[PDB]
From Swiss-Prot, chain A:
Transmembrane keyword on record: no
Keywords attached to this entry: Cytoplasm, Isopeptide bond, Nucleus, Ubl conjugation
Name assigned to this protein: Integrator complex subunit 9
GO cellular component: cytoplasm; cytosol; INTAC complex; integrator complex; nucleoplasm; nucleus
Pfam families: Beta-Casp, IntS9_C, Lactamase_B_6
Subunit architecture: Component of the Integrator complex, composed of core subunits INTS1, INTS2, INTS3, INTS4, INTS5, INTS6, INTS7, INTS8, INTS9/RC74, INTS10, INTS11/CPSF3L, INTS12, INTS13, INTS14 and INTS15. The core complex associates with protein phosphatase 2A subunits PPP2CA and PPP2R1A, to form the Integrator-PP2A (INTAC) complex. INTS9 is part of the RNA endonuclease subcomplex, composed of INTS4, INTS9, INTS11 and inositol hexakisphosphate (InsP6). Interacts with WDR73; interaction is required for the assembly of the RNA endonuclease subcomplex in the cytoplasm.
Primary subcellular site in the record, as a coarse category: nucleus
Gene Ontology biological process: negative regulation of transforming growth factor beta receptor signaling pathway; regulation of transcription elongation by RNA polymerase II; RNA polymerase II transcription initiation surveillance; snRNA 3'-end processing; snRNA processing
Function (record text): Component of the integrator complex, a multiprotein complex that terminates RNA polymerase II (Pol II) transcription in the promoter-proximal region of genes.
Note: Although strongly related to RNA-specific endonuclease proteins, it lacks the HXHXDH motif that binds zinc and participates in the catalytic center. Its function as endonuclease is therefore unsure.
Recorded name of the encoding gene: INTS9
Cross-link Glycyl lysine isopeptide (Lys-Gly) (interchain with G-Cter in SUMO2) placement: K58
Compartments reported by the entry: Nucleus; Cytoplasm
Swiss-Prot record, chain B:
Compartments where found: Nucleus; Cytoplasm
Stretches of the chain forming a coiled coil according to its record: none
Record GO biological process: regulation of transcription elongation by RNA polymerase II; RNA polymerase II transcription initiation surveillance; snRNA processing
GO CC aspect terms: cytoplasm; INTAC complex; integrator complex; nucleolus; nucleoplasm; nucleus
HEAT repeats: 34-73, 113-150, 151-183, 184-218, 223-258, 280-308, 309-347, 349-387
Official protein name in the record: Integrator complex subunit 4
Gene for this chain: INTS4
Keywords on record: Acetylation, Cytoplasm, Isopeptide bond, Nucleus, Repeat, Ubl conjugation
Oligomeric and partner information: Component of the Integrator complex, composed of core subunits INTS1, INTS2, INTS3, INTS4, INTS5, INTS6, INTS7, INTS8, INTS9/RC74, INTS10, INTS11/CPSF3L, INTS12, INTS13, INTS14 and INTS15. The core complex associates with protein phosphatase 2A subunits PPP2CA and PPP2R1A, to form the Integrator-PP2A (INTAC) complex. INTS4 is part of the RNA endonuclease subcomplex, composed of INTS4, INTS9, INTS11 and inositol hexakisphosphate (InsP6). Interacts with BRAT1; interaction is required for the assembly of the RNA endonuclease subcomplex.
MF annotations from Gene Ontology: protein-macromolecule adaptor activity
Protein family membership: Belongs to the Integrator subunit 4 family.
Highest rank taxon of the organism: Eukaryota
Entire protein: shown range: 33 to 593 of 963
Source organism of this protein record: Homo sapiens
From Swiss-Prot, chain C:
Biological source species: Homo sapiens (Human)
Organismal lineage: Eukaryota, Metazoa, Chordata, Craniata, Vertebrata
Active site residues per record: E201
GO biological process terms, semicolon-separated: regulation of transcription elongation by RNA polymerase II; RNA polymerase II transcription initiation surveillance; snRNA 3'-end processing; snRNA processing
Motif segment (HXHXDH motif): 66-71
Name of protein: Integrator complex subunit 11
Similarity annotation: Belongs to the metallo-beta-lactamase superfamily. RNA-metabolizing metallo-beta-lactamase-like family. INTS11 subfamily.
Residues binding Zn(2+) 1: H66, H68, H155, D176
Effect noted on mutating V508M: In NEDMLOB; uncertain significance; may affect function; the orthologous mutation in Ints11-deficient Drosophila is unable to rescue locomotor defects
Keyword terms: Cytoplasm, Hydrolase, Intellectual disability, Isopeptide bond, Metal-binding, Nucleus, Ubl conjugation, Zinc
Gene Ontology molecular-function annotations: RNA endonuclease activity
PTM info: Sumoylated; sumoylation regulates its subcellular location and is required for integrator complex integrity.
Cross-link (Glycyl lysine isopeptide (Lys-Gly) (interchain with G-Cter in SUMO)): K374, K455, K468
Amino acid sequence: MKLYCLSGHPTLPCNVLKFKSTTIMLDCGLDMTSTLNFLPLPLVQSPRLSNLPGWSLKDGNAFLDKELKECSGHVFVDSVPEFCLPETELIDLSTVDVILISNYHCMMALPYITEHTGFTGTVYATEPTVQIGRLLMEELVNFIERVPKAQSASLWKNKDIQRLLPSPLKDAVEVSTWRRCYTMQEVNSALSKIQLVGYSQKIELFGAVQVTPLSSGYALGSSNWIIQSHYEKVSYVSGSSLLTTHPQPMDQASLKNSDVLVLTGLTQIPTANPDGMVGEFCSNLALTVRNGGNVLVPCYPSGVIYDLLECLYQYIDSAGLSSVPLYFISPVANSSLEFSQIFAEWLCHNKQSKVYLPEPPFPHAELIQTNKLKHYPSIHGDFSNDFRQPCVVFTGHPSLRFGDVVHFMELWGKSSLNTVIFTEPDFSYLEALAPYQPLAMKCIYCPIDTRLNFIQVSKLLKEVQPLHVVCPEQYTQPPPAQSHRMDLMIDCQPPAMSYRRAEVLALPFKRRYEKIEIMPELADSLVPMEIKPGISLATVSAVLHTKDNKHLLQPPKPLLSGSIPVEQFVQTLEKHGFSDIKVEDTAKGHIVLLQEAETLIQIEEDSTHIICDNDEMLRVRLRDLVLKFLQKF
Amino acid sequence: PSKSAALHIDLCKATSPADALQYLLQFARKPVEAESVEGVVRILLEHYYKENDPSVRLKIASLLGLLSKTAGFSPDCIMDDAINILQNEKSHQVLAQLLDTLLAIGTKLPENQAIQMRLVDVACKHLTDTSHGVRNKCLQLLGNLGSLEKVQKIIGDYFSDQDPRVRTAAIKAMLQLHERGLKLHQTIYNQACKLLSDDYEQVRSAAVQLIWVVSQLYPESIRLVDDAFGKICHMVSDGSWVVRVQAAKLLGSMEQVSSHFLEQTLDKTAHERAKELYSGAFVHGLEDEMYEVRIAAVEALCMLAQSSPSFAEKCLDFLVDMFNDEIEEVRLQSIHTMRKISNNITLREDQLDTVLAVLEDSSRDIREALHELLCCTNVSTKEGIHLALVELLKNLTKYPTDRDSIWKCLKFLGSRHPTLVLPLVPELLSTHPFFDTAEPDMDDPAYIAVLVLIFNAAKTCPTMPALFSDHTFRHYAYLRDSLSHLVPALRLPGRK
Amino acid sequence: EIRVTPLGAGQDVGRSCILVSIAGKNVMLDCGMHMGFNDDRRFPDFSYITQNGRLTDFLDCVIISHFHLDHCGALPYFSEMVGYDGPIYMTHPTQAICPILLEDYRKIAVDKKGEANFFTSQMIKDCMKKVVAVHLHQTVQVDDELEIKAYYAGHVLGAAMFQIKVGSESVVYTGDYNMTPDRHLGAAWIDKCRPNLLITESTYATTIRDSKRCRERDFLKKVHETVERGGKVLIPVFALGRAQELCILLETFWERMNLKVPIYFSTGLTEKANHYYKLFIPWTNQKIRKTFVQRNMFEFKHIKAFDRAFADNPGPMVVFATPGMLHAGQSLQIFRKWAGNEKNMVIMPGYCVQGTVGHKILSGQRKLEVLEVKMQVEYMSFSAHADAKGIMQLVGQAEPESVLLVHGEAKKMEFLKQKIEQELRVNCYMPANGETVTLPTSPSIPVGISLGLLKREMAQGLLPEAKKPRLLHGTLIMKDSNFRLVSSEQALKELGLAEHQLRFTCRVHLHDTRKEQETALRVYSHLKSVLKDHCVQHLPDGSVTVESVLLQAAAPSEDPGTKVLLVSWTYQDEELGSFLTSLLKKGLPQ
Ligand SMILES: [Zn+2]
Ligand SMILES: [Zn+2]
């Protein structure tokens, strides 16, 4: 069973597994870290972004001052932001049968694969995952659009120049395969190729395999996949979170008893304590608002935002800051809020009960009804009229490379009272903020993560006891941040064989048994017989019918095994009618002579030879006499 | 040069999963040869192909297929690939890549016989796999390799093979065979009769296409096209929703069918109850899960209604009733189909219902579509014209923004059948017999609306300027001066 | 085998409750009451399931289809007084809706009957604490072998079929369901499960419901003309189900026509019905679940809570009212208020209970109690049940092997059975309440198998030698746990038994003058000429080989006229060995 890893990212995997006569791809991860290398996409051109000085090739042969620009002694490319892709050329994706989705973050890259390659297979995902994915892709398309930055810097992409270019540009990967953002017609085609699935729905593929999504708990609708035939198990776990959260609690029960366990999407900041760091969030926000500045907060309009909003809802009354309003600005803010409200069956038990007691499960509905929190499509329009200060503004894109956050933060950077508070842990906020540096704005880094940490990983591995474990090489090797620490690298027995970007692996498994069904008529017809204690066997004879890779047997050459004792041979010959049979012994066998037809039989260990005259009736009589002194196989 | 350097680098690296993968990715990612050196590169790649870990070989075959698009390679690559396939039988993936490369070569340029499409086809046929290795891909290979206008036997057996995926592959190959003609035999009809009931998705989805395409060729079974249409009908209620789209579209495209059997689709009614008061496939297809199938149904109905001059009268009620569908797309499609079948059709009592819709909130598209429908409909009863006139006046007085279309629809409604309006002339414009009526305002866009009808009707009937009152003559001159694309020239004495 | 015992709804309606004994497991589908029997006979009998013991001992799990009283009304009674702690399965909407209806029915019983032994609010809360939720198509493992699956039904929001499957045996219980899509609920949909048994309703088995679109067209025309004439409109429909469908239809038509006349909806159950229909969007079909992105169809712009004092208000009006049965009739209040006027309309979109004010109004007599009714009544039919064509289509789609009808009348039961037996050639039944019916199963035992044997056997089948019995052989190793089918050699190696070889050597006597030296060559030439397509070879040592049969010219015998040919063969090729001996008995060509 061959496993292909087509994305070196430790959190946004793309894994093509092969099983029986089927090929299954898991996840379509869009490494949106690569976008960091490009300049921001302003909503309105600002002089400082416009007039940035040009980095120059030291040789000067190439005219790279136009492509590259430098700020704070650093270098950035200058074009429309870009995105890295999974390496699609390892295997023709067109031969891929089924695609599975883990979570809205892991399905971000879906259109590229679903449309361009000619993929004709089906796609599976949970209802909230597909909806919120259609929301995020809409947001991304809108952000990249709305200010088409036509420029296309391509000379820098060359490998030879890339070698000379300074860091981090030296650090780019597969710079060649980068592709511009997709469009809405592709998005619609992708989302229309999808088909839905609920939790624990046992989807059978051609009878060839059986796939099941199980509650993960990371976010609202994230699913850990389980692929099984009747005698195997491959558990693909991507982004679970056993902490106490709003999504449906993680179910480890079915995970145990797994042949192969693919593990992905561990935490990003292992040392981060979610609860204490949310406390730091609230304290810092309160202090800044009391100082009277303005607070900016980048965050995807989903996921962690809702937990953050519950915490803020409970904490605001603690300091009595009712005066300061919360603005939530994004082209999908309203839709995301309503979709979070409707999905009750997927939330935690507490919230499902809050629904059974008629009331909207989340409290941000109560916030909106109270008018403390106001959601707006984008800064242009009504928000401009209804602005206030001081305030707390939830922007759209935490990549800091585009959206409404870039404009707000070019607006507020000059001041020092104002503060930007990072929460989404997916991007190195240092590189994120590099282009805007210098900045008087106080920068606070409190990155909230909820994915399982290494200790819980060890617990789960011991609880499930897998036959094999497969994880990214980043986990196996200790993080570069703390080479000293040992808890920061995964541990298992046998050791988790690792992998890297664009790698091919062969699982240490062999196909031995598979499932086939007998039919009752033949079952009744068959008569078991025993040779050993507790072992009853019977020779079989039938015709197989195969449908949809499912096999069945119905009624329409076995051989011999076992020595024939000469004493019983002669006894049964005499009691059946034979006479004048004389037996002599040899070193290891017996020679028995029957006078009729002059039949001589030599019986040795695992050897019996009969020699008679040209006879047919007596020959067949001897055949049926001797064959019935053993067990037929 | 570059190819030789790449081959040397790959040989030097000799790293099992690292060097080969990196070299293949770089070579494919960077660029094509764009020269005759493609043959040398292919020879070098085949030289290293003798190795282990068939993943590298598969990647090399993919690179070869990509390079084959350059059109530079011809018979050398074909011979090399045939030789490699003759002995490279290892697992399914390697044969898969080899078959893909062979297909690329075959359809890339040669498109010819003489071991350009025949030898490869024979080799693929002889290389039939045991377990899903190439089966589908070799089927589509022979599908794109059309032997001649004389092959169907092999696919005949393969239809009832193991895997539904292979069944779909055979079906698509059959489609490719048909699209080049090939005069498919009749027995495929009877063979696909069972394919209809395959009890798996993605199979029937194209089995329906096959039954349609074979049926439309020639209607001779015992009734053949009628039988196939009956099969499609019995299928229209398929469990899925994806099938029904093809089901509807294909029966719509079909055009010739037995009349008597055609109405049996629509036969079940409150509609006939209303008709008396004044005096099954589509029946279910029209009301289905999601609007896609409704759109397909209305399109099929409009197509075959156009085809058959009869059967239209039976479908007017089924169209008109389905106006308040709540899906604007279905709204618009219903209006469009009614327009497209509006000919030799009567609305003895349907007038009021189809006109009630004219009052929509704004629905500018819907109301404009209704005007378009009216300008091309037909009515037979004078009271019908009167009724349409009064509802149009209400429309104009409530939505004073589309008068510019109200006038044109009235113009056509007059020109289409003039004599119907002649009895209305005394009544519609006040002409109190022995009182001189006060000049109605010249520019009022209700008086202009009712005048344009009369003037357009007046081209035909010579007697009616007698009915025309005092003002109407100078008013006609003013209209004919203002709106020259609504009122034609007439015989009036004032403007000779 | 399958045992089915309907404790209710046996050629009848109401208090539906089915017991299924399958593969030694007892599952109780649905447990509700029904009106009309003020005695305890309304509730399902329990003296047969467990007599007078502990229910959990015998029962395995309780399944609830939807929240209609006649299905979900016995939950407190069955699970609190009688005593049950086992799992109760029901979809989230059913779980959220049934408690309110149960509380209302409890209050109604207190107010009208006042039965001493009647479940109390605390007890309903305790019962509902013992529920378990199920989403669409979610297979829930009741135990290690029994699993239940749900499906979208659409009889009301959250209604669901259930597929109770064990091993290969499976029974599909549909309960109340609709196959005609409504204006807010999608039609019931199912897989091709091919169950052995299928329980279904027949509430409208004798009525082919006509085109719903045209029916509602007529309804809307009538309401429009009624509002035009200045009269008032009273629409009695019980607060759940049909009320919201009417509300959606009227609201959409109303917004389109831009009419302004205010419309009121009966209070009391609105505050809960709308809230649930708003929080449970992901059940309400494609139109709503799509349009939800911009607006939420259940936040009504022009429908407002009704007020009693508005009854006297002049001008044309539209008001919904409760209950649909008019027995108590908060609707009946306005009906009595306006009965004199002939301008007003009233619509009864459902069947009334015979022998009640519902039937009195159904019949056209003015004197209905003695007060005279004058306004006009229209007896419409907006029921959300299954039409005969719906049942036939659903059974055809599921492709079952045996059907079983409940939830209806005996005579219609008979008509439907006759038609279905004639049509689909499928077994049918008609269990009367309390009658157990047994049906035989096909418990095919599963077995394991080695991959390679199957692979080569399928390769042989692929080879164009089919239609000739290839006699799939081997042996079944039994452990009482994992029956595994294996090939002969694999079983030999696994069990360690010796590979016994059986050899027969026959002395063919050839009587001819030909030389002994050429005898072997003659044998080779004759066998190669006779046995076509057989591997016939002449070894360098003078022997002959035919497949695996070795023919050797033995040493000269004491009889000059007799030559001995040893034909030695194994048991496996003993067929060809015997054939060779028979052929050689005829003698070599001379
Ligand atoms: Zn019901
Ligand atoms: Zn019922």
